[PDB]
Amino acid sequence: TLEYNANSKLITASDAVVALSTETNIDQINVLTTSLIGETNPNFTPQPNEALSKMIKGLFESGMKNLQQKKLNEALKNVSLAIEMAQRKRAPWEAFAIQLPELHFMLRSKIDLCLILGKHLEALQDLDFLLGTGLIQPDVFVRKADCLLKLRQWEEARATCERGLALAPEDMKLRALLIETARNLAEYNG
Amino acid sequence: NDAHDLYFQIKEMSENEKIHEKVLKAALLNRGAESVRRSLKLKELAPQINLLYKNGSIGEDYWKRFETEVKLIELEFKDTLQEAERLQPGWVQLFVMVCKEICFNQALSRRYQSILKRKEVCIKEWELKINNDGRLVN
Amino acid sequence: PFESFLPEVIAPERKVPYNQKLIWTGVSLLIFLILGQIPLYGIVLRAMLASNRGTLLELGVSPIITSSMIFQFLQGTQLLQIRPESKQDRELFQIAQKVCAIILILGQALVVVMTGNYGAPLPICLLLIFQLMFASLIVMLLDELLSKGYGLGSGISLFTATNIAEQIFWRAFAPTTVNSGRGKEFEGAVIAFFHLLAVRKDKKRALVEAFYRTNLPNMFQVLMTVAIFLFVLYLQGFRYELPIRSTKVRGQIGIYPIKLFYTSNTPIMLQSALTSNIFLISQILFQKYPTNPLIRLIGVWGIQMALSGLAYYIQPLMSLSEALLDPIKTIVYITFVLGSCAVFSKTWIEISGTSPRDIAKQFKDQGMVINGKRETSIYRELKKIIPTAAAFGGATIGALSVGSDLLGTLGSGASILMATTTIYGYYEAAAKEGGF
Amino acid sequence: NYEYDEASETWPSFILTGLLMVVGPMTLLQIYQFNEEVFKNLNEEYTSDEIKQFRRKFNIIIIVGWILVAILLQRINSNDAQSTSHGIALPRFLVDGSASPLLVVCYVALLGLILPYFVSRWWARTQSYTKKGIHNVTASNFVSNLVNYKPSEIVTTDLILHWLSFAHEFKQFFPDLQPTDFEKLLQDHINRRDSGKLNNAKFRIVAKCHSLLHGLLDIACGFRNLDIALGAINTFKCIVQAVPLTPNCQILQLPNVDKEHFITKTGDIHTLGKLFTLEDAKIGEVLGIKDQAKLNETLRVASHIPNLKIIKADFLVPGENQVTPSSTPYISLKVLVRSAKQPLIPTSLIPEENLTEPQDFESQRDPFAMMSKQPLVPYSFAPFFPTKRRGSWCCLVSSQKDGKILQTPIIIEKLSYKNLNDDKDFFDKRIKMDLTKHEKFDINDWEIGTIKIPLGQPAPETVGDFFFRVIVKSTDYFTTDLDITMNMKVRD
Amino acid sequence: VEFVREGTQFLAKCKKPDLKEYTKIVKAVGIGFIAVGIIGYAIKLIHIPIRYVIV
């Protein structure tokens, strides 16, 4: 079953245990309802909003400003808040070809900052998402193999370097990464 | 495992408890997005199933079942679109593109949400010793 | 062209494995063999054990064979104008097969039941018609089933090979006896051998008495037919393998086998049909007119073997005694049958579209070439291979038939050759495809 | 009309001949009637009794024919004995006595009941199984599992065990248990735990999992999915060796070690080469067993499992010298089965004779005949698997532009393990004295195996370099596998 | 006599079967021949007393 709130207009399943599909569908319906309550015009167009994009850009600029001032802690926080706001306060029916590249452009800077700071697992997961969602470039496999070497996974690092060289065989950093991976693996087996 | 019956449940709840009007539109858009997603999935999976069947590795009844589901999805989409016409006057030309976009948007949203759970499985599998601030302590 | 909704077995959507194929073949064969041993209902030694006369298999496969040959002749004479570019005229020809076969079955059943010896006096006649119609339709459906893909091959060839093997085995292991004055003697070879060896208690005499047996089958014929079977099996593996390579998609290398038995049992069949027809014609002509110069010249029939006639000159030799009796008849008959087989094989390869020119055309179409030779010489290379193969295959088939009829085997060389070819086809297909 | 045997004077001879033609050949045929396996003895010394008992639990016709022949011959010899009169050999009471309706009723029964029922049973039984060897419901479940598979969910061993626990072939064995019980039994097997009462069912389903995992791998390669295929191979390894997947597993698959000591004491030994780097007694002191008669067995097991290594790999087309557009090439690998104890032999020392392909028509018409002539792989050392298995290597090829498996996996079974024998024990890693310049080292004694994989798809019609990825994994041990990339230079 | 010479020249270049292949050939073909012959003979023999009793 499922109960319907009155003042918040949010649907919640009052059952003891629920499946995962039911829960994610109820969450999607809640998101769509919270968007429709806010958007006024009944015949809404897939055209993106303006004030939300302005706020997101302002937050991302305030986060990028701290790099020039050499504060690598609050810059990452501001970038994370910008990404969270972009993923939270944006209606689902907005243009996908405009909603995806902004996420890519902010996630790239977040990845660079997390890699420079010292966090490697978060950066590795961000690289994996960014590569599985449709972005394959030689500037991705370099960083992915870097993380996989920093947290000591040598077979995956070698496979990543090989797949990176199978796309841009003229690269000068993937070759050094492959040399280092081969050395570490030969010390690992011998 | 679908969002088809959840809209009907919300509809029967509205017929009794006088819920708002936009919840119906939300459930309808969700059902339309799911129908579009399933149609694209079947359109992309058809050749591999055909090859598995021709090679003799899937059976004889599953092929008929797949061919039946192919048109069951179209019937469901037509019913959803008729209901969209019934719910709002002149909302059939834009409903399709709205669903076409919310499908991709919510798929991307789920893919991005899954990384928090994806991050701990690798810790458990590789036996990492991660302290606070995400650094390694060997 | 027209619309027809006739019962037909649908082909499997996927390739059937070998075990199911073998089991379906065996089951269909068992059904066909059981169907031909049950007599009709209303009809009024055995007199029905030798031939399938008086059973539900009266017509048998005869209407199917007649429809096949008449439509094959109509296709060969180029009056249908078939074009393989369409996938509808083929189905039209296939349904023409059946619409001719069914009406031929109806006509033949009517003629047999209204003229045959079953009896002129309505319900009994209707039942006798329905039995034959249902049996022939069952046989046709079973052949179609075996041909659609559920069986190892065609149905007619399997049925003929089964009949041949059954006759060969019944001539040797027949439990029936014959009592003519002296006593009861088994009509088999091995059965009578063991019987005369056990009960007579005179082994030295019983061996010669059961080994020759001028009046009934004996053991010498069994040994001779086993030897001829082994030799025929040996001459089936002969093949000329010339190397070919592809030019469209490089990396496709193989061989093209050119067998020795290139015509594969056809010229001997043509020769046998011609000889039977001319012998029957001469016999009927001698029956009609007692004495005439030309009729006395062609053949003088007497006690039925004609004497001092051309039919006598072309009459086959049953044993070595007749051969030694008149050397001229042998030295004419051997050369006649060998030359006829060779000429028939050559004409058949020239007619049936298997001439070296057509093979060269197929090679040019597929894009293949010969390994160590050029492109403009495939025809000149096939001309030096295929005609000699066909001629010598025909000559060898004729010589095998002559030797088999001379040594006095349990079955003629033509029937053993047909059965061996039919079974070797299944064996070669199973080996090439791969199956248990 | 026929005349049936009235005085029993003809049918004895017929039955005697019928019996002889069957007895003679059978008696005649009764009168007429490459790879060293080192683990065949050491496997039966470590298998527990509960598995031995399970594997244990789960000519008279000639003599009777000769006695019947003797009886028939005695009866024949004991007997007393113009137009033609035909007769039959069968006795008279069979057709004219009181047993006349019995013959026809038995005929009608055997024709109408036994034939159609048995034929229908055989047809319904053969129409239910898949060409691969698994049920139709199991294949349907596997396809339905891979259809709605969220790509965000990461594949593990627990996921594939959960998928396996829904096989229909597990229900025919024990129609009382539930899929949760099957998953619990599989977890108990992998974690080396005791079930108490369902051991005879655990062993059964664990021995059955072989065909199920092979079919799942086939279907996953058919759907062009690499992660699920790799997970299936790893799960097969874990099921065979009875060990959960961890980083230091090549050293935990050994027969007699204690994890509570090795894990907590050492933390840098993860492979077998790193283990054989240490001395002879240091290995025992690290693994914590301190028993020489018991240390020699584990050292004989650890130095006899095969590791691979490439010598030369390229795309070859039969009858040409290069790859051209729309041609049909294949893959040619020259591997070297080595032990974890031997040092590396340089590729330059190979005399180049074993690496070249013969150029002859009989050799280039079918390039797999030379591969099909190698000896089989010996029996593996798996004391916890119920049945007895042979080794195997599952090789699958994928692409590098997108990362999708593009053909079903080839499974090789013939390979030569000559380099693992005990006569080449001088070639040890701890001597560090450049053992290539040794008195016993002859580079013509080391065997170089070959692996040929048909590509199944022709070369692209364009011109350029196209990269692939070949993976050759084992299915029994946790050894060193192959993972190489190679490109075909379509040059026209 | 030239025809026999060409025939022998063709027979020379042919590919005769060896012992290992001829054994498989004779085994398979003999098995098939016996399998069809025994079935035909048994069906022909069984139906004599049945056809006596029934008809």
């Binding site: - | - | 069952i138 079973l142 089933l145 | 047809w123 | 008809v55």
Partner: protein, 32 residues
């Protein structure tokens, strides 16, 4: 349109029907 089992059943049914007709006629002639 028609399956192999249908053909087998048709054949066995026709054969058994003919045999049953024979034996029924024989028994009827023997009794009366």
């Amino acid at each position: 349109r028609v399956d192999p089992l249908v053909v087998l059943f048709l054949a066995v049914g026709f054969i058994f029907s003919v045999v049953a007709l024979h034996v029924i006629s024989k028994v009827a002639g023997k009794l009366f």
